Design a protein around this motif. Sequence first.
Motif, PDB file in Angstrom:
ATOM      1  N   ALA A 106      33.415  46.904  41.666  1.00 20.93           N
ATOM      2  CA  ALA A 106      34.798  46.446  41.707  1.00 20.93           C
ATOM      3  C   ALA A 106      35.711  47.343  40.884  1.00 20.93           C
ATOM      4  N   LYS A 107      36.651  48.018  41.550  1.00 19.89           N
ATOM      5  CA  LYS A 107      37.718  48.696  40.829  1.00 19.89           C
ATOM      6  C   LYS A 107      38.881  47.770  40.540  1.00 19.89           C
ATOM      7  N   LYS A 108      39.039  46.696  41.333  1.00 20.27           N
ATOM      8  CA  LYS A 108      40.043  45.671  41.103  1.00 20.27           C
ATOM      9  C   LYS A 108      39.386  44.299  41.203  1.00 20.27           C
ATOM     10  N   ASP A 109      39.996  43.312  40.555  1.00 22.23           N
ATOM     11  CA  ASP A 109      39.488  41.950  40.644  1.00 22.23           C
ATOM     12  C   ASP A 109      40.084  41.241  41.855  1.00 22.23           C
ATOM     13  N   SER A 110      39.702  39.967  42.025  1.00 17.62           N
ATOM     14  CA  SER A 110      40.071  39.199  43.215  1.00 17.62           C
ATOM     15  C   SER A 110      41.572  38.991  43.331  1.00 17.62           C
ATOM     16  N   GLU A 111      42.317  39.154  42.240  1.00 18.14           N
ATOM     17  CA  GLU A 111      43.763  38.999  42.234  1.00 18.14           C
ATOM     18  C   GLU A 111      44.490  40.350  42.214  1.00 18.14           C
ATOM     19  N   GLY A 112      43.784  41.444  42.498  1.00 19.41           N
ATOM     20  CA  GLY A 112      44.398  42.763  42.559  1.00 19.41           C
ATOM     21  C   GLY A 112      44.693  43.435  41.238  1.00 19.41           C
ATOM     22  N   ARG A 113      44.158  42.921  40.137  1.00 12.82           N
ATOM     23  CA  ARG A 113      44.283  43.578  38.848  1.00 12.82           C
ATOM     24  C   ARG A 113      43.216  44.664  38.713  1.00 12.82           C
ATOM     25  N   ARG A 114      43.555  45.725  37.987  1.00  8.44           N
ATOM     26  CA  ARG A 114      42.532  46.706  37.645  1.00  8.44           C
ATOM     27  C   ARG A 114      41.395  46.002  36.915  1.00  8.44           C
ATOM     28  N   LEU A 129      27.257  35.707  38.646  1.00 10.95           N
ATOM     29  CA  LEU A 129      27.071  36.537  37.455  1.00 10.95           C
ATOM     30  C   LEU A 129      28.283  36.382  36.550  1.00 10.95           C
ATOM     31  N   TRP A 130      28.058  35.873  35.359  1.00 11.18           N
ATOM     32  CA  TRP A 130      29.111  35.681  34.373  1.00 11.18           C
ATOM     33  C   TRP A 130      29.081  36.871  33.430  1.00 11.18           C
ATOM     34  N   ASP A 160      29.898  35.294  46.923  1.00 10.55           N
ATOM     35  CA  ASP A 160      30.728  35.815  48.009  1.00 10.55           C
ATOM     36  C   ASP A 160      31.244  37.223  47.746  1.00 10.55           C
ATOM     37  N   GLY A 161      30.936  37.798  46.593  1.00  9.65           N
ATOM     38  CA  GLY A 161      31.426  39.107  46.299  1.00  9.65           C
ATOM     39  C   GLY A 161      32.783  39.148  45.643  1.00  9.65           C
ATOM     40  N   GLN A 162      33.285  38.012  45.163  1.00 11.75           N
ATOM     41  CA  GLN A 162      34.567  37.977  44.477  1.00 11.75           C
ATOM     42  C   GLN A 162      34.370  38.244  42.999  1.00 11.75           C
ATOM     43  N   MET A 163      35.188  39.133  42.447  1.00 11.71           N
ATOM     44  CA  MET A 163      35.159  39.481  41.025  1.00 11.71           C
ATOM     45  C   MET A 163      36.333  38.680  40.442  1.00 11.71           C
ATOM     46  N   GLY A 206      31.610  24.509  38.676  1.00 10.94           N
ATOM     47  CA  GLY A 206      31.126  25.115  39.889  1.00 10.94           C
ATOM     48  C   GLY A 206      31.307  26.618  39.787  1.00 10.94           C
ATOM     49  N   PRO A 207      30.964  27.352  40.844  1.00 14.87           N
ATOM     50  CA  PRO A 207      31.107  28.820  40.804  1.00 14.87           C
ATOM     51  C   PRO A 207      32.504  29.280  40.383  1.00 14.87           C
ATOM     52  N   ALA A 208      32.569  30.111  39.341  1.00 18.39           N
ATOM     53  CA  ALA A 208      33.817  30.676  38.851  1.00 18.39           C
ATOM     54  C   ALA A 208      34.817  29.611  38.449  1.00 18.39           C
ATOM     55  N   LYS A 209      34.338  28.394  38.132  1.00 16.63           N
ATOM     56  CA  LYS A 209      35.197  27.295  37.694  1.00 16.63           C
ATOM     57  C   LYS A 209      34.731  26.838  36.317  1.00 16.63           C
ATOM     58  N   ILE A 210      35.462  27.239  35.274  1.00 15.87           N
ATOM     59  CA  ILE A 210      35.202  26.810  33.904  1.00 15.87           C
ATOM     60  C   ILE A 210      36.458  26.160  33.345  1.00 15.87           C
TER      61      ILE A 210
END
Length: 308
Positions: A106-114, A129-130, A160-163, A206-210
Amino acid sequence: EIPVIEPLFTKVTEDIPGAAGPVFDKNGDFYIVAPYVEVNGKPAGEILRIDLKTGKKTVICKPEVNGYGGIPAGCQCDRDANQLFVADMRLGLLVVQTDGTFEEIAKKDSEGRRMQGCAYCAFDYEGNLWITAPAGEVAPADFTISLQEKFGSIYCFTTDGQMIQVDTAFQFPAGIAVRHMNDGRPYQLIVAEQPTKKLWSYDIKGPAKIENKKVWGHIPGTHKGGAAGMDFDEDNNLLVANWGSSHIEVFGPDGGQPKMRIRCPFEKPSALHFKPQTKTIFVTEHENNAVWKFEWQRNGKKQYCETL
């Protein structure tokens, strides 16, 4: 007074610049990372395999993207394929094959940030993966670290491949660990914030939910450093390298203050990982830039790669 034990540590290998990221793969082979290997004074970090019967080291991967060297810093092994997920302070998240090929995820995250450079990671039992990200932006950006300023972040790289960036504003976030129910469901995330001498907890919904960030434990000492790598034993005690203190801290299931300390024969423990199905803990350290092992009271908590 917190009780202290002083078990015998056995040196495994040395001459590993910045020794970190101890990990076992699906076949029981052992790997570490050398984040501080440099070529011409630029980053040229390495991932290495160690033959535990002789201590012999073999360079597996020297990651580089478009001429920008990596600083590999922490590892997890995958479950469904024998490949290493590697947190890299310059390149972010790597997936590294045993044949030395690798991909930068990943060069960018799921929201388009570097993307930010990463240090530690932990698979939950569902395969998410946390990841702690104490560096600033990944290469080709100039290298920066959140040692003084609170720009370190936390990510979840999902099935799903989301960073997904899940939190921000940490001052050098370091070790990370996931607590699971007896039935296997993840439900608590522990995150070290090194210089603040804090362990933070989150409820995992849940996944990516903290949610519900709270101070969960306190790291002893006023030395430079603090909590580095960490891992659970099979009774869900959290063992935490306290870089700069010459100790590994042991927290019980409910956190707070350490219930026991483990004196190390070196000042700067950086990471620790159990050998599967044993009481043996492998510890990396930066005083001698070396890997050691010692025997704990019980086996480790199974890693994701050990589940079916």
